A paper describes a structure:
Clearly, the recovered DNA contained oG* in addition to the N4-modified cytosines (C†) without observing the uncaged oG oligo­nucleotide, showing the integrity of the DNA in the G*O co-crystals. Crystal photosensitivity was tested by exposing fragmented crystals to 365 nm LED light for 10 s at varying energy doses, followed immediately by flash-cooling and data collection. Here, the exposure of G*O co-crystals to light clearly affected the crystal diffraction power [Fig. 2(d)], with dark crystals diffracting to ∼2.7 Å resolution. However, the observed illumination-dependent loss of diffraction power by G*Odark suggests the enticing possibility of directly observing hOgg1-catalyzed DNA cleavage at the oG site, which leads to a single-strand break.
GIC is not catalytically competent, as the potential base is hosted within an exosite. Only upon recognition of damage at the GIC stage is the nucleotide loaded into the active site, where oG was first excised, followed by cleavage of the DNA backbone via β-elimination [Fig. 1(a)].
Residue numbers in the entry: 11 to 323
Write the structure that this text describes.
DNA sequence: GGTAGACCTGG
DNA sequence: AGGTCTAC
């Protein structure tokens, strides 16, 4: 049959209690957090989650999930253990109603816009996927990032299943990305200079930093200590490190600063740098702007940012 | 020690 | 969407 819909094969879906006010798929899944989610049917989002493929759709009160067991298994509704993977991914224990309240309390501007854009939360992503996706994000549009990431997974990622005319692949290992002649191969896939960064970082982690554990144990480390460590890797500067911290390493206070931020900082908040004499973006001033919004929104500043970014782009 | 080049490209 | 490395 291939890609399932809620109407098409109703016995195969299981529901996770979640109102649209807590999660809007259409606002989080395509919004440049993950690049590997596709809306194959209208309102149905298919992607790879915990090394299986899932199709997600939502009604007013429920989030509907189905998982694609292969030719190995018979068709089954998602198990409670399987569904806890989905819950974990979307970090539903974090309650947006409460966060939106707190942000709207201490920021009148937020109140105005966040009323229109609810359900904008942050995914908890695998650090590897996240790192390499955002290494490729340098000087890059979401569309081209999406293609680069997709091509990279087809090339070096294990085959999961085929639905319709789409072959879902897992995100590649450090071993695959550290393999010989990978950079050359990735250039043929049009990553450009990012090809060198992918290979160099995969090798840097495996051969110098002590492997996958190093990257994963940056979850337990502080935001300060995790950011310093990521920046050692080739291709990883301040902005990429903040993205990884915020989307993979459980640092909600991380505020990745780009010119989009500055536009928002000036238009909406009328913000000027005080410490640095420089009036434009720099290492000093971006450090301020991150601190400013952490001061303004507090520990979940990064999540609050996402509501504003999802309002514009 | 904050700034102006090169790096890839789809344009 | 447009950041990271290198250079003085
Ligand atoms: Ca994995
Ligand atoms: Ca199953
Ligand atoms: Ca794929
Ligand atoms: Ca670096």
């Amino acid at each position: 049959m291939g890609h399932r819909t809620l109407a098409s094969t109703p016995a195969l879906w299981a529901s996770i209690p979640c109102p649209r006010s807590e999660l809007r798929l259409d606002l989080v899944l395509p919004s440049g957090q993950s690049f590997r989610w596709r809306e194959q049917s209208p309102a149905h989002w298919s992607g790879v989650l915990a090394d299986q493929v899932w199709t997600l759709t939502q009604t007013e009160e429920q989030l509907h999930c189905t998982v694609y067991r292969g030719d190995k298994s018979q068709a089954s509704r998602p198990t409670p253990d399987e569904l806890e993977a989905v819950r974990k991914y979307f970090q539903l224990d974090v309650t947006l109603a409460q966060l939106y309240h707190h942000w709207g309390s201490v920021d009148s501007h937020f109140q105005e816009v966040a009323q229109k854009f609810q359900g904008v939360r942050l995914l908890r992503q695998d650090p590897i996927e996240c790192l390499f996706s955002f290494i490729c994000s340098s000087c890059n549009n979401i569309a081209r990032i999406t293609g680069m990431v997709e091509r990279l997974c087809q090339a070096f990622g294990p085959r999961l299943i085929q639905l319709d005319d789409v072959t879902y692949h897992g995100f590649p290992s450090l071993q695959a990305l550290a393999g010989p002649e990978v950079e050359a191969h990735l250039r043929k896939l049009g990553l450009g200079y990012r090809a060198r960064y992918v290979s160099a970082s995969a090798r840097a982690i495996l051969e110098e930093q002590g492997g996958l554990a190093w990257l994963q144990q940056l979850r337990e480390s502080s935001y300060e200590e995790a950011h310093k460590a990521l920046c050692i890797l080739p291709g990883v500067g301040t902005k990429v490190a903040d993205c990884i911290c915020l989307m993979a390493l459980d640092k909600p206070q991380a505020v990745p600063v780009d010119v989009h931020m500055w536009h928002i900082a000036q238009r909406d908040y009328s913000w000027h740098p005080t410490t640095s004499q420089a009036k434009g973006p720099s290492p000093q001033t971006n450090k301020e702007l991150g601190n400013f919004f952490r001061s303004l929104w507090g520990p979940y500043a990064g999540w609050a940012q996402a509501v504003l970014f999802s309002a514009d782009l």
